[PDB]
Amino acid sequence: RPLWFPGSQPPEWLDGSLPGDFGFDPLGLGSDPELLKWFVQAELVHCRWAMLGAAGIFIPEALTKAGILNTPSWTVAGDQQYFTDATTLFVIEIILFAWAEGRRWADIINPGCVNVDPVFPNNKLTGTDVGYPGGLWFDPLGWGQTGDAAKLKDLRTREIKNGRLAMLAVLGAVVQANYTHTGPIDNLLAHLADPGHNTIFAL
Amino acid sequence: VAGLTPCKESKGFAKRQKQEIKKLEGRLKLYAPDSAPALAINATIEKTKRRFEFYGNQGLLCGTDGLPHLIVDGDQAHLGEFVYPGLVFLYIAGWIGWVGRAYLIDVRTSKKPTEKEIIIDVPLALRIMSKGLTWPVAAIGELRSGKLVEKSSNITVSPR
Amino acid sequence: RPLWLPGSEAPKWLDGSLPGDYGFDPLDLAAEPGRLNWMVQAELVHCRWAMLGAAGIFIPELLTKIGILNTPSWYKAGDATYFADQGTLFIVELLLMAWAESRRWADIARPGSVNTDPIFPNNKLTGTDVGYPGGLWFDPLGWGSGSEDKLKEIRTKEVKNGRLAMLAVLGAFVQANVTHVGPIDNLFAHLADPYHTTILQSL
Amino acid sequence: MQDVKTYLSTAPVLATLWFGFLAGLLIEINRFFPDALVLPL
Amino acid sequence: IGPKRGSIVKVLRRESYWFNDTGKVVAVDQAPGVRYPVVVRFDKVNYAGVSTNNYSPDELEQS
Amino acid sequence: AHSVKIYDTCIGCTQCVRACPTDVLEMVPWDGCKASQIASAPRTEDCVGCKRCESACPTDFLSVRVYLGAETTRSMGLAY
Ligand code: CLA
Ligand SMILES: CC1=C[C@H](O)CC(C)(C)[C@H]1/C=C/C(C)=C/C=C/C(C)=C/C=C/C=C(C)/C=C/C=C(C)/C=C/C1=C(C)C[C@H](O)CC1(C)C
Ligand code: SF4
Prior knowledge:
Chain A is mainly α. Chain A is 50% helix and 0% strand. Chain A starts with 32 loop residues before the first helix and ends in a 10-residue tail after the last helix. With 160 residues, chain B is mainly α. Chain A binds chain D through residues 29, 31-32, 35, and chain D through 1-2, 5. Chain A: The light-harvesting complex (LHC) functions as a light receptor, it captures and delivers excitation energy to photosystems with which it is closely associated.
């Protein structure tokens, strides 16, 4: 078992059964079993929103620097004008995510209850674990439903560790915009020129 | 009503608007026009001018002091002075009184009823704080069903 | 049966016999014994007054937009003059509402008591269930009798069309309060620019 | 969290968290809607 | 004597703190000559902090 | 001086005598409790009136009861 602090004893609540479990709990906030299942569910949607966040921050701004796309910076992207006002873009999204996350709220509380499509009862999700819904809408290639459990755990471990790098990255993009007032691709190319000086201590 | 002029046509109410901006304009004379403390007094003046234009547009009654007076009798012109925010208040105050009453019933039928009042059971509390929304239909419903009041034979009464 | 919230336990009072039962009593307004008999009668007048309300608010305003009635708006219909005084028509209504609702009040209190005529007692109402006064005056086509599974479907169709009308009439009320435009024109201003005619833009 | 949330559910902490939210709400009502003497609705 | 051990009684004694209050009987003394044999335990303490008090069977009814 | 009265609600728990600082109360035999003893106040003229016995009585309401009446040099607690 790989662990974050190789001399330390791993915690009792982190038994290695969860994907991406490396025993990192110094404050011990996942000690309660009922709160640990909520926090794993909190970490899953945090990971996937940050990877979707990192593909809208670092991917199109790299294409903006390379001249592939003329999209604005991620900090000033909400300030731009669209066909729908940004105040009423939220309540369209809030209504659309009251069905997306509110039906996800029932799956965390009651597993195996919102897996059936209400409009057409023949359609259902091929998922058995909380946080991994499956089905055609979410797993159209069927890679997440495998018979073997060792490959399935490593692929979920691959999902978590790709997630938590982006949660460092989107948080990294927030503080870089607050400190340097510059896009993080432009902070990378400034750091790729002279990495000795172009850092956080360049002021 | 009650010898009070409306505040939109009150000369004393317009005098208090004139002498409040003039107090704040003289405070602005010792600052730079683009300075940070001058933006606070400029926001104070626009807060004052918003206030006086809001009081005159609501049909407020101003006396001889130039001050807006509230008519709490239940006048059809004056509902938002006492009757409308009173019904808004009593709904909120009855919400506080109904979710505190329903919490005590929910913890009286418990193993240790006194440890649930120093340590308030938030999943038990938050599931009835939502239920305090519809409380006039639940207070008079408990009043009509007899569950709101306790009979005097089961109430601790000090002797005569 | 389907419920208002998947993964949520149905309340013990709403057991699924009542037409239109989706286990929707989150605030417990019909818990008490003997209370759900009053709240169905309350739902039935409110749903039928709203379907009477929606046929007098939207249908004459829709035909005013076509222009084959030229009826005034419903929120300005109290200012319209008639052959009677507008204040007088209130009290003549509540003398007729004193008769019609107190005959309905005794049916909820003592069922099977006021189905007979007060004047010519050979005329008796054929309704058996509380809240369904079958007779020649109210159901002349005899659609309120049959099998219990067939009767439950048409009683489900009253309240599902009735709950929509309640939401409708409550919508027209708030629309006429903050926008001061009649609700068929509010529909036609929403099919032109839907993302600019929203409750946030109307505040 | 079997005992940390029990401490967080105590009477002084829940009074601080509620009145922190309550005075936090009533201050933010008094920013966007200040000088409110008459309810217009 | 007494109503029952382990039963719910209501105190009719005027000067007690637990007048018209639900109490649980824990002991009834069957020795003759005892004026207040029924020992009733209460969920709430009085101002002295105790919950144990002795009452006669004439000052209690079953509720 | 002070009149200390014992009532029949006493359980013979003896703590009214143990709380007495002027030796007023004593435990006499009795037939009305499990302990088969009741308090009494023979030296009630020595009573200061402090009601330490009423503070230590677990019976609701109190079995020992001190009524503050005529006060003399015993019940005033003076040394001069
Ligand atoms: C995915 C993680 C990640 C990555 C690769 C970067 C990369 C960069 N950051 Mg950094 N940063 C991060 C997250 C990240 N950061 C976080 C979480 C914060 C909040 C504290 C910031 C806040 C921050 C500021 C305010 C600034 C930078 C700047 C920079 C650049 C110079 C290096 C430096 O001074 O680092 C500073 C690093 C930190 C303050 C935090 C350490 C970063 C993480 C937490 C540790 C490493 C994690 C992981 C092992 C990285 C894997 C890298 C791998 C892909 C090769 C560099 C391109 C500077 C810049 O613009 O350069 C011109 C700048 O001024 N960063
Ligand atoms: C676990 C543990 C253990 C024990 O408990 C102790 C402690 C220490 C406490 C711990 C730890 C912790 C931590 C580290 C935390 C952190 C986290 C994070 C950072 C997150 C993020 C997270 C993040 C996230 C989700 C993110 C998201 C994002 C997004 C949406 C974005 C978006 C966008 C885009 C696309 C672009 C455009 O143009 C703009 C926008 C719109 C802006
Ligand atoms: S303290 Fe009270 S109960 Fe105990 S012996 Fe003295 S008088 Fe009796």
